[PDB]
Amino acid sequence: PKMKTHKGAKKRVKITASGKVVAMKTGKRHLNWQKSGKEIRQKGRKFVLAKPEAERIKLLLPY
Amino acid sequence: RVKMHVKKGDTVLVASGKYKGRVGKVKEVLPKKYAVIVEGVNIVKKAVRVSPKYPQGGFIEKEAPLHASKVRPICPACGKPTRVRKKFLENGKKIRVCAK
RNA sequence: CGAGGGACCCGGUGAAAUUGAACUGGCCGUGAAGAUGCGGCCUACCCGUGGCAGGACGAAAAGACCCCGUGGAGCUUUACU
RNA sequence: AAGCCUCUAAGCACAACCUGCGGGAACCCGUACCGCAAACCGACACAGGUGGGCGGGUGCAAGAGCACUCAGGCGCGCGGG
RNA sequence: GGGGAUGACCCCAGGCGGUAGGGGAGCGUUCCCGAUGCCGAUGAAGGCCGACCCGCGAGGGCGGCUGGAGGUAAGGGAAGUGCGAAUGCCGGCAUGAGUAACGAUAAAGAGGGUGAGAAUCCCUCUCGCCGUAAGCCCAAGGGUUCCUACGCAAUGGUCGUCAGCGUAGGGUUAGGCGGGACCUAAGGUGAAGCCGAAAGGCGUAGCCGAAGGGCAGCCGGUUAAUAUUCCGGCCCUUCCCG
RNA sequence: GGUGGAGCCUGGGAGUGAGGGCGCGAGCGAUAACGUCCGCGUCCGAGCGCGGGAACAACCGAGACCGCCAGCUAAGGCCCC
RNA sequence: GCUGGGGCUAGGAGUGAAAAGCUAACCGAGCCCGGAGAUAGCUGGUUCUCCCCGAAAUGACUUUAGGGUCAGCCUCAGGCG
RNA sequence: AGAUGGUAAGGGCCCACGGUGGAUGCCUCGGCACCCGAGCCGAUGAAGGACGUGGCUACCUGCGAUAAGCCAGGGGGAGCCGGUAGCGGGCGUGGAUCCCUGGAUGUCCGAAUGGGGGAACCCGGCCGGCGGGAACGCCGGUCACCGCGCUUUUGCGCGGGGGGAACCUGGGGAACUGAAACAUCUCAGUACCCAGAGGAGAGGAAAGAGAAAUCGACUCCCUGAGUAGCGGCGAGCGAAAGGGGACCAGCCUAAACCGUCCGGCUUGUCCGGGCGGGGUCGUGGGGCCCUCGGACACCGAAUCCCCAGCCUAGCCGAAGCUGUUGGGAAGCAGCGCCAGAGAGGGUGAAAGCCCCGUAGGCGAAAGGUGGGGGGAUAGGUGAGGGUACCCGAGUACCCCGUGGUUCGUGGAGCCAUGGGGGAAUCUGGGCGGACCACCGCCUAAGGCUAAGUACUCCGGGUGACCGAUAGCGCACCAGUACCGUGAGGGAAAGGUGAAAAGAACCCCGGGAGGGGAGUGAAAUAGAGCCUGAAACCGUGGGCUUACAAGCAGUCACGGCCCCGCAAGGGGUUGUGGCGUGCCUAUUGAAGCAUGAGCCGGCGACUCACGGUCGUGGGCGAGCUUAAGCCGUUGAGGCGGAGGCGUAGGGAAACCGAGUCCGAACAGGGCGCAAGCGGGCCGCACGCGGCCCGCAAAGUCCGCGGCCGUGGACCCGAAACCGGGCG
Ligand SMILES: [Mg+2]
Ligand SMILES: [Mg+2]
Ligand SMILES: [Mg+2]
Ligand SMILES: [Mg+2]
Ligand SMILES: [Mg+2]
Ligand SMILES: [Mg+2]
Ligand SMILES: [Mg+2]
Ligand SMILES: [Mg+2]
Ligand SMILES: [Mg+2]
Ligand SMILES: [Mg+2]
Ligand SMILES: [Mg+2]
Ligand SMILES: [Mg+2]
Ligand SMILES: [Mg+2]
Ligand SMILES: [Mg+2]
Ligand SMILES: [Mg+2]
Ligand SMILES: [Mg+2]
Ligand SMILES: [Mg+2]
Ligand SMILES: [Mg+2]
Ligand SMILES: [Mg+2]
Ligand SMILES: [Mg+2]
Ligand SMILES: [Mg+2]
Ligand SMILES: [Mg+2]
Ligand SMILES: [Mg+2]
Ligand SMILES: [Mg+2]
Ligand SMILES: [Mg+2]
Ligand SMILES: [Mg+2]
Ligand SMILES: [Mg+2]
Ligand SMILES: [Mg+2]
Ligand SMILES: [Mg+2]
Ligand SMILES: [Mg+2]
Ligand SMILES: [Mg+2]
Ligand SMILES: [Mg+2]
Ligand SMILES: [Mg+2]
Ligand SMILES: [Mg+2]
Ligand SMILES: [Mg+2]
Ligand SMILES: [Mg+2]
Ligand SMILES: [Mg+2]
Ligand SMILES: [Mg+2]
Ligand SMILES: [Mg+2]
Ligand SMILES: [Mg+2]
Ligand SMILES: [Mg+2]
Ligand SMILES: [Mg+2]
Ligand SMILES: [Mg+2]
Ligand SMILES: [Mg+2]
Ligand SMILES: [Mg+2]
Ligand SMILES: [Mg+2]
Ligand SMILES: [Mg+2]
Ligand SMILES: [Mg+2]
Ligand SMILES: [Mg+2]
Ligand SMILES: [Mg+2]
Ligand SMILES: [Mg+2]
Ligand SMILES: [Mg+2]
Ligand SMILES: [Mg+2]
Ligand SMILES: [Mg+2]
Ligand SMILES: [Mg+2]
Ligand SMILES: [Mg+2]
Ligand SMILES: [Mg+2]
Ligand SMILES: [Mg+2]
Ligand SMILES: [Mg+2]
Ligand SMILES: [Mg+2]
Ligand SMILES: [Mg+2]
Ligand SMILES: [Mg+2]
Ligand SMILES: [Mg+2]
Ligand SMILES: [Mg+2]
Ligand SMILES: [Mg+2]
Ligand SMILES: [Mg+2]
Ligand SMILES: [Mg+2]
Ligand SMILES: [Mg+2]
Ligand SMILES: [Mg+2]
Ligand SMILES: [Mg+2]
Ligand SMILES: [Mg+2]
Ligand SMILES: [Mg+2]
Ligand SMILES: [Mg+2]
Ligand SMILES: [Mg+2]
Ligand SMILES: [Mg+2]
Ligand SMILES: [Mg+2]
Ligand SMILES: [Mg+2]
Ligand SMILES: [Mg+2]
Ligand SMILES: [Mg+2]
Ligand SMILES: [Mg+2]
Ligand SMILES: [Mg+2]
Ligand SMILES: [Mg+2]
Ligand SMILES: [Mg+2]
Ligand SMILES: [Mg+2]
Ligand SMILES: [Mg+2]
Ligand SMILES: [Mg+2]
Ligand SMILES: [Mg+2]
Ligand SMILES: [Mg+2]
Ligand SMILES: [Mg+2]
Ligand SMILES: [Mg+2]
Ligand SMILES: [Mg+2]
Ligand SMILES: [Mg+2]
Ligand SMILES: [Mg+2]
Ligand SMILES: [Mg+2]
Ligand SMILES: [Mg+2]
Ligand SMILES: [Mg+2]
Ligand SMILES: [Mg+2]
Ligand SMILES: [Mg+2]
Ligand SMILES: [Mg+2]
Ligand SMILES: [Mg+2]
Ligand SMILES: [Mg+2]
Ligand SMILES: [Mg+2]
Ligand SMILES: [Mg+2]
Ligand SMILES: [Mg+2]
Ligand SMILES: [Mg+2]
Ligand SMILES: [Mg+2]
Ligand SMILES: [Mg+2]
Ligand SMILES: [Mg+2]
Ligand SMILES: [Mg+2]
Ligand SMILES: [Mg+2]
Ligand SMILES: [Mg+2]
Ligand SMILES: [Mg+2]
Ligand SMILES: [Mg+2]
Ligand SMILES: [Mg+2]
Ligand SMILES: [Mg+2]
Ligand SMILES: [Mg+2]
Ligand SMILES: [Mg+2]
Ligand SMILES: [Mg+2]
Ligand SMILES: [Mg+2]
Ligand SMILES: [Mg+2]
Ligand SMILES: [Mg+2]
Ligand SMILES: [Mg+2]
Ligand SMILES: [Mg+2]
Ligand SMILES: [Mg+2]
Ligand SMILES: [Mg+2]
Ligand SMILES: [Mg+2]
Ligand SMILES: [Mg+2]
Ligand SMILES: [Mg+2]
Ligand SMILES: [Mg+2]
Ligand SMILES: [Mg+2]
Ligand SMILES: [Mg+2]
Ligand SMILES: [Mg+2]
Ligand SMILES: [Mg+2]
Ligand SMILES: [Mg+2]
Ligand SMILES: [Mg+2]
Ligand SMILES: [Mg+2]
Ligand SMILES: [Mg+2]
Ligand SMILES: [Mg+2]
Ligand SMILES: [Mg+2]
Ligand SMILES: [Mg+2]
Ligand SMILES: [Mg+2]
Ligand SMILES: [Mg+2]
Ligand SMILES: [Mg+2]
Ligand SMILES: [Mg+2]
Ligand SMILES: [Mg+2]
Ligand SMILES: [Mg+2]
Ligand SMILES: [Mg+2]
Ligand SMILES: [Mg+2]
Ligand SMILES: [Mg+2]
Ligand SMILES: [Mg+2]
Ligand SMILES: [Mg+2]
Ligand SMILES: [Mg+2]
Ligand SMILES: [Mg+2]
Ligand SMILES: [Mg+2]
Ligand SMILES: [Mg+2]
Ligand SMILES: [Mg+2]
Ligand SMILES: [Mg+2]
Ligand SMILES: [Mg+2]
Ligand SMILES: [Mg+2]
Ligand SMILES: [Mg+2]
Ligand SMILES: [Mg+2]
Ligand SMILES: [Mg+2]
Ligand SMILES: [Mg+2]
Ligand SMILES: [Mg+2]
Ligand SMILES: [Mg+2]
Ligand SMILES: [Mg+2]
Ligand SMILES: [Mg+2]
Ligand SMILES: [Mg+2]
């Protein structure tokens, strides 16, 4: 039957108009104590390289 | 359970045999194999001495049938013979007002 | 050493697993490292009958020992539920 | 437990039961053959297994053991060198 | 890259080993549009050949023999579409090979007869084996295998005229023998009753349930095949009637 | 300089992730292994197509589009097979 | 003690003078059907032809080393030149 | 001293002819899938069988001691006594055989049902009959259980038991697999077990839905939408509202009040129950009393009656001859004919005009259906005020433990409840997702309901469906032979010829088997007989082998033989030279690693729904249909519910060519406009934007690669669970 949208992907990443995949940076949620204002602050929606051709495949029917 | 296009009795004419056309009297009709045995094809069929109905050594007996799709019934005064019609108060066979 | 039932010959019926095709020699070397088939030398007319089983890594069973599989079961306990 | 022997309840004692004398009726299934093998069970005319009874005589002390033989069967369903 | 008659035809330069792979171009089979058509007894599909023709090919034409009634362009499409391997499957035929075996080492020999054909079938004379059986009588079990007549298509571990093999015709006779119309044990079913989602499971009385109890038959003859049943003698039992 | 099945970007599509030999630079080993694991390159794998090394994948030459009863050469040889 | 006849006990169960034996010729949990065309990163097989290019056995990670995701190597198409 | 020819017990290669062998080619009496019509049977004895019946009968089929059958009616009109032969018999225009409907009989078993029973057997009771009939036997009725109404107990009538290919509902209910282990989850409430009913079932007239003061029973399809949501937030599972459609039907009953009878009895003035009037509601309805009154007019079945029509048998139904090859004309040649019929099949071969039927039109005595259409009846019909008597009791509601909806305990609603507590009757309650107030919707704790939807034992028509290793397991005398105690497993086996015209007769031979002769177009078309391949086994001819060593071959020279007028070609190897079978798995195979005895046949990368990319088209800021409706039954249109994109950011609010991070126009991430075909010279070189490439710009369809869910390239487990057989 019709394929199902991966709800983990739909809740974690956000695909833009021109094919790019926008997701947050890691190493921030659990422990944030011994980090500078740079390491706390620079969580700025990193981009994913050569994996979005295997990441927009499960953001498929509604994109 | 196909019926026939000829009766018992009524004079019939062959069309597509080894011989092409001679007048005969249909005996008998036999609609199981759908084949008339009218008067035409005598056969040389073998027969064992055992019985004996012919007490020397004979080699010919009763007949051989012809397929009923070849033959056609004549109306008795016409020369017309090909067609069939029915249904005038009794199921007869009348074409080109020739009788049955 | 002797006797009987087989083995051997003849008359009759007459299978079986195996089987790539084979016109299938020995030695010394090479080749996946144990050669009838590759190279060199030597021997050998063709085809059989009875026997031995040394070879064809002969046959049987997709190792029965060992290892792997996030294989499956039997059993144990203060391993979990 | 039943047949049979005996005593009684309801009932019946013109009935009912017992012994004789004469006359009738007695129904449904099995019934052959093999049954310790060629016919049963073993894919087979298979050296295997299959319950009960009669299962002789003579001699070995006795005996269903052993040896032979009555009645009964059999030469084993491939033979000849 | 060029002559660019755009030539989808010829020149120039370079290249053309290849697995797993990536890509391009074709052949063959079933069916369908073309097909209310065309080819086909002067011979269709299929089978056996060709040293013939074309194509780098899967192949396609043409010629000959057999065959007896179907096949189908060109241009396209849909695939149950191409086999040598899977200790693949199914059917046939080989090797093993005229080889092992032919089934308890109880044992055969001979003369006649039938018959086309006899070590094997029938009769006769010897020899051997079992004889607490390799003999006889029943219950299991098997289901006509029993007998006669006619035969060897197939079977009998050989042959076979024989057969427990085939065809046809007969053959099993019961008040007293073994079972039911008698009874009961283990066990099963099961009025009442009890329990469980349903199917159902226990279960008194009663019923079924046997090589258990009771019940009236012994001897001999008869057929090729039936016998305590048919027959001869003889004795009994159950029930009913007067 | 270098027009080459050279490169660069995007998209589609696989396969591979057991390697091995040889020379050098090394480790472990024993300065042993056709032993194990790296790097620099080649070859086999995928060139078991060819010639030589007798035979042999990696030692040498050479990179097989097809055909010819034509020559010249690479490695290796010129006594005969 | 042996045995005939009629029965009862059964699959995570029965039975067992206890071997994990036997339960219809194979029992560390039978047989038949269905789920079920279960799963298998584990073997084997995978069928017409021609042409062009052409690999890898490497790196980074995984209750993982015989399998994987990405990168490296290859091919096709479209652009840069 | 020498040497070539030569011998073939036998072999090898090639050629020709045979046998075994049954593939290929061609046909169907066959089943497969779709479409509709239709869809329960049965104590008045089902589905299915055992046994028996034919003058002779092995089997299949039809029947049941009335036994390949009997009676009545309709069709049918001349051949019959089934497949099915053979001997022997009789029937039919005075309407035989055959088909359909209604009847009768219908042994025995089987729900089995008098009882027992190991199914196809045995034994009975009561009432009548028969045999001489008391004892013995037979025949014809009745005798099982359960739930109801009457019958005060007795008994009499009405139903149920069992089966049915698939479907449906309710009660139980798994495991392997997926998460690359795996216990919550998925598989899945699926397979499977039980119960009842049906031609469907279930559900159904709101204590609904959910935001609009909106819709208005229920079922099914497409959308919404793989959206919201749930989930070790992993695997994965997955709506609902609304809309476009198919269909459209709504009702009955308890309660309050009233009449009769019965029960307890204080026979009082009330209680308990069955009947008759009275009520089916959210706009609140309804009981009693008063007023408006008039219905005596209308609606109307889902009930009943009749009928159109359909089914179980059928019928009519146009149009051709001659000559030739041949055994056969339908081919071919000439002249024609019909068409509301030129679909198909058979006809010795290839036919519109030879036959059966297709086009079209008629056909019911009798029995089913009659959802379609006309009639009848039951049943419904109204407004204001007063009274607050009634509106579905261990029930709503609360707590704990549960299932379903996407809801897995999370903030956890709603629908049913296993247990505990526990009321009210419109100023009473439930819902709008913990909960409170407001505002909206509806009346639960009783029941029924057609139509639209699923499936095919069976009937027929169709098929880019098949053609005996295919197709269902069986085209054939198949769920048979055979295996297994049993549950169960499970085959192979089609073809002579136009017509058996099936080979009379002679001879050999015991027979079988043939050789002749004859029929036959053909007899290698001979009776399991069309075509008849290969492996395999032989016979006859050419070449070569008894001094040569090889995965058996290739090249060269020569000899021998055979074709061709010749040139040349074909079969063989005596010698020389060169040479490690195929595939897999591998760093690596001729491998003493695996598979293969040979031949013929079967077989392995598709398909549904979707995503991405490329390609051929259509249209373009638009593209585009699904479900369904209307048409001949091989013809298309209608049908904008819906989907993608045109504007995107942000978690959302919200904003927008900008958004967010942030106090901010710092700064950054997302998009944005950047110009392709470009006569655009409108005459201002800012050129605004134009003939204009179907494109930046996207959609629909086709064709390919790949992917996900489905078994997904095929084969193969050790095992697990459910139901049963032993
Ligand atoms: Mg969307
Ligand atoms: Mg003629
Ligand atoms: Mg012996
Ligand atoms: Mg011999
Ligand atoms: Mg060696
Ligand atoms: Mg060699
Ligand atoms: Mg050698
Ligand atoms: Mg030996
Ligand atoms: Mg007593
Ligand atoms: Mg006897
Ligand atoms: Mg006797
Ligand atoms: Mg005995
Ligand atoms: Mg036996
Ligand atoms: Mg014997
Ligand atoms: Mg024996
Ligand atoms: Mg004994
Ligand atoms: Mg003495
Ligand atoms: Mg003595
Ligand atoms: Mg003794
Ligand atoms: Mg004697
Ligand atoms: Mg003897
Ligand atoms: Mg003998
Ligand atoms: Mg013997
Ligand atoms: Mg040139
Ligand atoms: Mg050049
Ligand atoms: Mg190439
Ligand atoms: Mg390749
Ligand atoms: Mg076909
Ligand atoms: Mg013609
Ligand atoms: Mg010819
Ligand atoms: Mg064909
Ligand atoms: Mg012929
Ligand atoms: Mg195929
Ligand atoms: Mg083969
Ligand atoms: Mg083999
Ligand atoms: Mg075989
Ligand atoms: Mg010999
Ligand atoms: Mg020998
Ligand atoms: Mg030997
Ligand atoms: Mg011997
Ligand atoms: Mg002997
Ligand atoms: Mg003698
Ligand atoms: Mg003699
Ligand atoms: Mg004599
Ligand atoms: Mg003798
Ligand atoms: Mg018996
Ligand atoms: Mg028997
Ligand atoms: Mg017999
Ligand atoms: Mg005799
Ligand atoms: Mg014989
Ligand atoms: Mg014999
Ligand atoms: Mg004789
Ligand atoms: Mg006999
Ligand atoms: Mg006999
Ligand atoms: Mg009794
Ligand atoms: Mg009696
Ligand atoms: Mg009793
Ligand atoms: Mg008693
Ligand atoms: Mg008892
Ligand atoms: Mg009992
Ligand atoms: Mg019981
Ligand atoms: Mg007894
Ligand atoms: Mg007794
Ligand atoms: Mg007597
Ligand atoms: Mg390159
Ligand atoms: Mg690895
Ligand atoms: Mg590695
Ligand atoms: Mg390495
Ligand atoms: Mg190494
Ligand atoms: Mg080394
Ligand atoms: Mg290379
Ligand atoms: Mg080699
Ligand atoms: Mg060399
Ligand atoms: Mg090499
Ligand atoms: Mg080259
Ligand atoms: Mg030179
Ligand atoms: Mg015993
Ligand atoms: Mg089980
Ligand atoms: Mg246990
Ligand atoms: Mg126990
Ligand atoms: Mg056992
Ligand atoms: Mg086991
Ligand atoms: Mg399986
Ligand atoms: Mg499953
Ligand atoms: Mg994997
Ligand atoms: Mg290349
Ligand atoms: Mg990669
Ligand atoms: Mg390019
Ligand atoms: Mg000779
Ligand atoms: Mg021939
Ligand atoms: Mg032949
Ligand atoms: Mg044959
Ligand atoms: Mg009744
Ligand atoms: Mg019946
Ligand atoms: Mg019958
Ligand atoms: Mg009449
Ligand atoms: Mg009439
Ligand atoms: Mg007849
Ligand atoms: Mg006759
Ligand atoms: Mg007759
Ligand atoms: Mg007459
Ligand atoms: Mg009549
Ligand atoms: Mg009659
Ligand atoms: Mg009738
Ligand atoms: Mg009767
Ligand atoms: Mg009964
Ligand atoms: Mg019973
Ligand atoms: Mg009486
Ligand atoms: Mg009387
Ligand atoms: Mg009387
Ligand atoms: Mg009834
Ligand atoms: Mg269902
Ligand atoms: Mg349920
Ligand atoms: Mg599980
Ligand atoms: Mg798993
Ligand atoms: Mg679920
Ligand atoms: Mg029922
Ligand atoms: Mg039922
Ligand atoms: Mg319906
Ligand atoms: Mg319905
Ligand atoms: Mg209903
Ligand atoms: Mg209902
Ligand atoms: Mg209501
Ligand atoms: Mg809706
Ligand atoms: Mg609507
Ligand atoms: Mg009432
Ligand atoms: Mg009323
Ligand atoms: Mg009526
Ligand atoms: Mg007609
Ligand atoms: Mg006509
Ligand atoms: Mg003519
Ligand atoms: Mg025709
Ligand atoms: Mg004509
Ligand atoms: Mg019609
Ligand atoms: Mg009716
Ligand atoms: Mg209607
Ligand atoms: Mg009130
Ligand atoms: Mg919950
Ligand atoms: Mg609730
Ligand atoms: Mg409760
Ligand atoms: Mg509530
Ligand atoms: Mg609420
Ligand atoms: Mg209601
Ligand atoms: Mg059908
Ligand atoms: Mg078949
Ligand atoms: Mg065939
Ligand atoms: Mg049996
Ligand atoms: Mg002639
Ligand atoms: Mg002949
Ligand atoms: Mg002849
Ligand atoms: Mg033949
Ligand atoms: Mg034959
Ligand atoms: Mg034919
Ligand atoms: Mg033939
Ligand atoms: Mg010869
Ligand atoms: Mg010499
Ligand atoms: Mg020589
Ligand atoms: Mg050579
Ligand atoms: Mg292959
Ligand atoms: Mg490899
Ligand atoms: Mg090998
Ligand atoms: Mg070898
Ligand atoms: Mg291996
Ligand atoms: Mg082998
Ligand atoms: Mg910005
Ligand atoms: Mg920026
Ligand atoms: Mg733009
Ligand atoms: Mg696609």
Coordinates of N, CA and C (backbone and C1' of nucleotides) in Angstrom, one line a residue, chain E residues 182-196:
Chain E
rC182 P -34.9 -61.8 26.0 O5' -33.7 -62.8 26.0 C5' -32.4 -62.4 26.5 C4' -32.2 -63.0 27.9 C3' -31.2 -62.2 28.7 O3' -31.8 -61.0 29.3 C1' -30.7 -64.5 28.9
rC183 P -30.9 -59.7 29.4 O5' -29.9 -59.9 30.5 C5' -30.3 -60.2 31.8 C4' -29.2 -60.7 32.7 C3' -28.0 -59.8 32.8 O3' -28.3 -58.7 33.7 C1' -27.3 -62.0 32.6
rU184 P -27.6 -57.2 33.4 O5' -26.1 -57.4 33.9 C5' -25.8 -57.5 35.3 C4' -24.5 -58.1 35.5 C3' -23.3 -57.2 35.2 O3' -23.0 -56.3 36.2 C1' -22.9 -59.4 34.3
rA185 P -22.0 -55.0 35.9 O5' -20.5 -55.6 36.1 C5' -20.1 -56.1 37.3 C4' -18.6 -56.6 37.2 C3' -17.6 -55.6 36.6 O3' -17.2 -54.6 37.6 C1' -17.3 -57.7 35.6
rA186 P -17.2 -53.0 37.3 O5' -15.9 -52.8 36.5 C5' -14.6 -53.0 37.2 C4' -13.5 -53.0 36.2 C3' -13.4 -51.8 35.3 O3' -12.8 -50.6 35.9 C1' -13.2 -53.7 34.0
rG187 P -13.5 -49.2 35.9 O5' -13.8 -48.9 34.4 C5' -12.7 -48.6 33.5 C4' -13.1 -48.8 32.0 C3' -14.2 -47.8 31.6 O3' -13.8 -46.5 31.2 C1' -14.8 -50.0 30.9
rG188 P -14.7 -45.2 31.5 O5' -15.7 -45.2 30.3 C5' -15.3 -45.2 28.9 C4' -16.4 -45.5 28.0 C3' -17.7 -44.7 28.1 O3' -17.6 -43.4 27.5 C1' -18.2 -46.9 28.0
rU189 P -18.3 -42.1 28.1 O5' -19.8 -42.3 27.7 C5' -20.2 -42.3 26.4 C4' -21.6 -42.9 26.2 C3' -22.8 -42.2 26.9 O3' -23.2 -41.0 26.2 C1' -23.0 -44.5 27.3
rG190 P -23.6 -39.7 27.0 O5' -24.8 -40.2 28.0 C5' -26.1 -40.4 27.5 C4' -26.9 -41.1 28.6 C3' -27.2 -40.3 29.9 O3' -28.3 -39.5 29.7 C1' -26.4 -42.5 30.4
rA191 P -28.3 -38.1 30.5 O5' -29.8 -38.1 31.2 C5' -30.2 -39.2 31.9 C4' -31.7 -39.3 32.0 C3' -32.4 -38.3 32.9 O3' -32.6 -37.1 32.4 C1' -33.2 -40.5 33.4
rA192 P -32.0 -35.7 33.1 O5' -32.3 -35.9 34.6 C5' -33.6 -35.7 35.2 C4' -33.6 -36.0 36.6 C3' -32.8 -35.1 37.5 O3' -33.5 -33.9 37.8 C1' -32.3 -37.3 38.1
rG193 P -32.8 -32.5 37.4 O5' -31.5 -32.4 38.3 C5' -31.6 -32.4 39.7 C4' -30.3 -32.8 40.4 C3' -29.1 -31.9 40.1 O3' -29.1 -30.8 40.9 C1' -28.5 -34.2 39.8
rC194 P -28.5 -29.4 40.3 O5' -26.9 -29.6 40.3 C5' -26.2 -29.9 41.6 C4' -24.8 -30.1 41.3 C3' -24.0 -29.1 40.5 O3' -23.6 -28.0 41.3 C1' -23.4 -31.3 39.8
rC195 P -23.6 -26.5 40.6 O5' -22.3 -26.6 39.6 C5' -21.0 -26.7 40.2 C4' -19.9 -27.0 39.2 C3' -19.7 -26.0 38.1 O3' -19.0 -24.9 38.5 C1' -19.7 -28.2 37.2
rG196 P -19.2 -23.4 37.8 O5' -18.6 -23.6 36.4 C5' -17.2 -23.6 36.2 C4' -16.8 -24.1 34.8 C3' -17.2 -23.2 33.7 O3' -16.3 -22.1 33.5 C1' -17.7 -25.4 33.1

